[PDB]
Amino acid sequence: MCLKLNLLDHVFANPFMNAAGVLCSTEEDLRCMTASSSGALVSKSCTSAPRDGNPEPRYMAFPLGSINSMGLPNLGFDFYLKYASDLHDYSKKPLFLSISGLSVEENVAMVRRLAPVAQEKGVLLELNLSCPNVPGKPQVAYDFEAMRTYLQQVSLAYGLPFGVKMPPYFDIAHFDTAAAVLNEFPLVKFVTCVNSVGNGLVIDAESESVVIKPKQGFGGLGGKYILPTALANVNAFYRRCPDKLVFGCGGVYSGEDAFLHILAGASMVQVGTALQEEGPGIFTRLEDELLEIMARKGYRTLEEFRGRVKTIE
Amino acid sequence: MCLKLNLLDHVFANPFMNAAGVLCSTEEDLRCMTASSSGALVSKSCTSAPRDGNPEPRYMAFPLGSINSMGLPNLGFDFYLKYASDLHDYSKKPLFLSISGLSVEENVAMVRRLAPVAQEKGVLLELNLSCPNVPGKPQVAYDFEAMRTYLQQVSLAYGLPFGVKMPPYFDIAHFDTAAAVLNEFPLVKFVTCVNSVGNGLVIDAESESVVIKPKQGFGGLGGKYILPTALANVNAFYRRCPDKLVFGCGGVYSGEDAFLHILAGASMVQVGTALQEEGPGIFTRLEDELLEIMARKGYRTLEEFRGRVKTIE
Ligand SMILES: Cc1cc2nc3c(=O)[nH]c(=O)nc-3n(C[C@H](O)[C@H](O)[C@H](O)COP(=O)(O)O)c2cc1C
Ligand SMILES: Cc1cc2nc3c(=O)[nH]c(=O)nc-3n(C[C@H](O)[C@H](O)[C@H](O)COP(=O)(O)O)c2cc1C
Numbered sequence: 001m002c003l004k005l006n007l008l009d010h011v012f013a014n015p016f017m018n019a020a021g022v023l024c025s026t027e028e029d030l031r032c033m034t035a036s037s038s039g040a041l042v043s044k045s046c047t048s049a050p051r052d053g054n055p056e057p058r059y060m061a062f063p064l065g066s067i068n069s070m071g072l073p074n075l076g077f078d079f080y081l082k083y084a085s086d087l088h089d090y091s092k093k094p095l096f097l098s099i100s101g102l103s104v105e106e107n108v109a110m111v112r113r114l115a116p117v118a119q120e121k122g123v124l125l126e127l128n129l130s131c132p133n134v135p136g137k138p139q140v141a142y143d144f145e146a147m148r149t150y151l152q153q154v155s156l157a158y159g160l161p162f163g164v165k166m167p168p169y170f171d172i173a174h175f176d177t178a179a180a181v182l183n184e185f186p187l188v189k190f191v192t193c194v195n196s197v198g199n200g201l202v203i204d205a206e207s208e209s210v211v212i213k214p215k216q217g218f219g220g221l222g223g224k225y226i227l228p229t230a231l232a233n234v235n236a237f238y239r240r241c242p243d244k245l246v247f248g249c250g251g252v253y254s255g256e257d258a259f260l261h262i263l264a265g266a267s268m269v270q271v272g273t274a275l276q277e278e279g280p281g282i283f284t285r286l287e288d289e290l291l292e293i294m295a296r297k298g299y300r301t302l303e304e305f306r307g308r309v310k311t312i313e
Numbered sequence: 314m315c316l317k318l319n320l321l322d323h324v325f326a327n328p329f330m331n332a333a334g335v336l337c338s339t340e341e342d343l344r345c346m347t348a349s350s351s352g353a354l355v356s357k358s359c360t361s362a363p364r365d366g367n368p369e370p371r372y373m374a375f376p377l378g379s380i381n382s383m384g385l386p387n388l389g390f391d392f393y394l395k396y397a398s399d400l401h402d403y404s405k406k407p408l409f410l411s412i413s414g415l416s417v418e419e420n421v422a423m424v425r426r427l428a429p430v431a432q433e434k435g436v437l438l439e440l441n442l443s444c445p446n447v448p449g450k451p452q453v454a455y456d457f458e459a460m461r462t463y464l465q466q467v468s469l470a471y472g473l474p475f476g477v478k479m480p481p482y483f484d485i486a487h488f489d490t491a492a493a494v495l496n497e498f499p500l501v502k503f504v505t506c507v508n509s510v511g512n513g514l515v516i517d518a519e520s521e522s523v524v525i526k527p528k529q530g531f532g533g534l535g536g537k538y539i540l541p542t543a544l545a546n547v548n549a550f551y552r553r554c555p556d557k558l559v560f561g562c563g564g565v566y567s568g569e570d571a572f573l574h575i576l577a578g579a580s581m582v583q584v585g586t587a588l589q590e591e592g593p594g595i596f597t598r599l600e601d602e603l604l605e606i607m608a609r610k611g612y613r614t615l616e617e618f619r620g621r622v623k624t625i626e
């Protein structure tokens with residue numbers, strides 16, 4: 001009985017990894033995720049220049065999840081490139097590097113310089129499409145013409161297999177359109193579903209106040225609020241993108257939640273809010289939990305049930 | 314202390330009502346909501362002809378909420394009109410009628426016939442914009458040119474004050490666009506935020522199966538999953554539509570949840586999932602709990618705190 005996977009020409013002890021933005025910003029964080037029993041890690045989404053991000057408080061969590069408007073704080077691309085090229089021990093586990101440029105030009109600039117390190121060291125690019133572009137325009141992946149533009153330029157500029165991080169969608173015609181766009185690009189070998197549920201608003205009854213400072217309290221939602229939405233996106237893309245891998249992300253607190261993601265079609269399973277809250281010991285719990293479920297059901301490997309969610313008659 | 318209010322030229326004992334679709338489809342349902350402690354009721358969204366709806370199972374509920382793909386089962390427009398015209402006791406509470414035609418032409422033919430009963434009896438129109446139009450393309454409220462057409466044609470055909478039931482949005486540019494469309498229509502006097510969170514997927518770990526039969530298990534989410542999304546939509550529209558009222562719908566299980574919707578800006582508060590699960594006794598509990606939070610805070614009226622959610626710095 002085993003959780004091992006091999007994909008994108010890499011071998012993974014198990015399917016768990018942090019979600020981008022959680023426990024991945026500093027060298028300390030990245031060493032910690034490397035020391036964990038995660039099967040991989042992803043570095044904090046970066047921009048060309050380092051960023052302080054938004055004023056605090058900018059993340060808060062609660063029993064059913066989290067809200068954030070961090071504002072892409074990060075050490076800058078040069079830092080994460082260096083971590084990939086000189087500091088990361090790939091004998092431990094593979095490394096994804098998330099990039100989240102604020103324009104298509106910024107992303108092109110970073111991927112041209114990532115390419116030789118990716119070729120040589122085997123670092124895997126996760127391009128964040130759930131990302132602002134022009135203010136007053138929708139985020140990139142809710143603007144299908146900008147999304148096409150971004151994947152065209154990055155495919156050209158990078159020339160290597162990469163993956164994309166997607167916002168949730170809530171309409172079947174949007175699933176149909178978004179997957180068609182992704183399927184235009186052979187180099188997009190994996191699709192991570194999902195980024196947070198956009199522009200939620202948490203209000204504290206006692207103080208009569210929003211809980212985060214930026215954007216009048218509006219921010220992205222993660223955690224238990226978003227699991228069914230995350231499962232639907234994973235399955236929607238799994239069913240529409242047969243030639244690509246789908247990584248699952250949203251509401252994983254338990255091996256049973258990871259189990260559902262994998263039945264929906266997930267290959268890797270990312271952990272954001274639950275990992276922020278519980279810390280990296282979560283990965284041993286999740287592995288034990290999923291293995292216990294597999295044993296009860298008589299499944300010996302992930303491929304025996306990946307994508308095998310049943311529908312009704 | 315009593316929670317009485319007046320709006321749209323009608324008097325309400327309190328700000329609670331059922332959400333459209335819940336406990337509102339048959340004459341029995343409607344009479345049951347009328348006998349409840351609710352401030353108002355809305356009928357099931359209707360089409361010109363009666364509809365059986367989608368295959369069962371089509372609704373399921375769980376600790377954190379519900380998923381449904383009911384498929385607009387209803388007794389048809391002639392039935393709801395006759396309930397509004399001959400059967401409802403307006404001395405008991407106001408009545409809203411929800412219209413959800415599958416084309417713009419369907420909605421115009423229904424509102425033309427509704428207008429004289431509205432004039433004569435005071436029944437209030439809630440137009441459902443979270444409704445498909447054409448297969449292959451997005452639901453109406455996610456296609457702003459089609460939304461504008463529906464509002465233009467309906468305002469012309471109906472010619473009296475009405476309201477709109479909106480899907481959640483998740484992107485600020487989309488709030489800006491949707492609210493500017495609605496503000497083009499002086500007759501749209503209320504906006505109900507929000508309809509269910511579209512196309513989630515619930516999977517049962519034991520059976521490895523989705524839980525509703527239609528659409529391969531995909532359906533709208535309500536309940537606790539959706540409260541911060543509903544609060545964000547209530548507030549976003551409240552800030553953008555100073556000349557309209559905003560009705561809150563989504564994730565109300567408690568008087569505290571109703572408190573948060575009103576702080577966000579809600580005038581009326583609709584109850585779907587919680588009502589489906591608890592039954593119409595819920596309205597007494599909600600009233601008592603809201604009154605209790607008001608007492609503890611020293612609020613004497615809803616108006617003292619409606620829309621008064623505090624931001625940080
Ligand atoms: C504090 C915080 C920071 C995040 N930063 C990023 C980021 O930089 N890039 C990114 O793609 N997603 C980011 N996310 C999104 C998560 O990676 C994830 O998609 C979302 O939280 C849903 O997963 P969850 O339900 O496990 O939290 C962030 C989430 C949180 C809570
Ligand atoms: C079983 C079911 C049937 C529904 N039918 C309708 C409908 O006919 N029209 C409508 O505008 N919304 C309909 N809804 C949406 C609710 O009115 C409401 O917007 C949604 O459930 C979110 O509220 P809640 O969190 O309190 O459930 C329905 C919801 C449920 C659960």
Ligand SMILES: COCOc1cc2ccccc2cc1CCc1c(C(=O)O)[nH]c(=O)[nH]c1=O
Nearest residue numbers: 068069070071072073130131132139195196220
């Ligand atoms: C459009 O989705 C929100 O994500 C962002 C919001 C930003 C707001 C101001 C400046 C930069 C922003 C960057 C992002 C993308 C980074 C990101 C963040 C974040 O850094 O705020 N939080 C998430 O939940 N997901 C993300 O993908």
Ligand SMILES: COCOc1cc2ccccc2cc1CCc1c(C(=O)O)[nH]c(=O)[nH]c1=O
Nearest residue numbers: 358382383384385386443444445452508509533
């Ligand atoms: C736009 O998707 C949610 O609403 C509907 C979905 C339907 C699917 C197939 C056929 C008709 C549909 C009609 C609607 C509108 C009625 C409705 C329903 C419903 O009757 O399925 N459920 C909701 O949660 N909200 C609604 O507004």
